[PDB]
Amino acid sequence: KKPIYQQLRDKIVEAIIDGSYVEGEMIPSIRKISTEYQINPLTVSAYQSLLDDNVIEKLGMLVKAGARQRLLTQEKQYFLKKQWPQIKNKLERLGIDLK
Amino acid sequence: MMRWDDKKPIYQQLRDKIVEAIIDGSYVEGEMIPSIRKISTEYQINPLTVSKAYQSLLDDNVIEKRRGLGMLVKAGARQRLLTQEKQYFLKKQWPQIKNKLERLGID
């Protein structure tokens, strides 16, 4: 579910944020990832967006330095915008004042 | 009908619709809720599932089966449900969102 491809993208993103993938270190390559469970070896080209977005760089490819922080703030923005509300605000609907 | 195959079991979605009606006041304490049979035929739901949803509400003391009257809303139910919602959110939800604003700095 989801256009594939955020599944690899997000999985990688969460991998950096969890420190499973470390800054300035080789990631897995396309073969190993397509083999990982299964993926079309292209459609593993989520490695595209991460190149574009400066998460990873070009042997092998590595997580860029400053990558995790860029991703984190990028997560705060989203969460605060599209996520934090509807919970807020449904804290008030029920019970509140963290205790 | 009631559009689903979202993340939850169908009987849980139905159970939540009856709970909402009780909380909104559409059904009050002592009042008779629709029969399992009425819900099944009307909304075209599996009777076994409907019965499962009602039994869940029985075990929770939300409703009671009565002699000739059918299924009625038990007393104190609306508040018991509100507290339940609050509690379920607190233990089974609030943390792991916690626990989120942790992973990224926050108030």
From TrEMBL, chain A:
CDD domains per record: WHTH_GntR (cd07377)
Protein's recorded name: Transcriptional regulator, GntR family
InterPro entries: Tscrpt_reg_HTH_GntR, WH-like_DNA-bd_sf, WH_DNA-bd_sf
Pfam families assigned: GntR
GO molecular function: DNA binding; DNA-binding transcription factor activity
The entry's keywords: DNA-binding, Transcription, Transcription regulation
Coiled coil: none
Alphabetical list of PROSITE patterns matching this protein: HTH_GNTR
Phylogenetic lineage: Bacteria, Pseudomonadati, Pseudomonadota, Gammaproteobacteria, Legionellales
Domain HTH gntR-type, chain residue ranges per copy: 2-66
GO biological process, one term: regulation of DNA-templated transcription
From TrEMBL, chain B:
Domain HTH gntR-type: 8-76
One of the protein's GO biological processes: regulation of DNA-templated transcription
Alphabetical keyword list: DNA-binding, Transcription, Transcription regulation
GO molecular function terms listed in the Swiss-Prot or TrEMBL record: DNA binding; DNA-binding transcription factor activity
Protein name: Transcriptional regulator, GntR family
Gene3D superfamilies per UniProt: 6.10.250.1220, Winged helix-like DNA-binding domain superfamily/Winged helix DNA-binding domain
A Pfam family it matches: GntR
Keyword Electron transport: no
Source species: Coxiella burnetii (strain RSA 493 / Nine Mile phase I)
Stored InterPro entries: Tscrpt_reg_HTH_GntR (IPR000524), WH-like_DNA-bd_sf (IPR036388), WH_DNA-bd_sf (IPR036390)
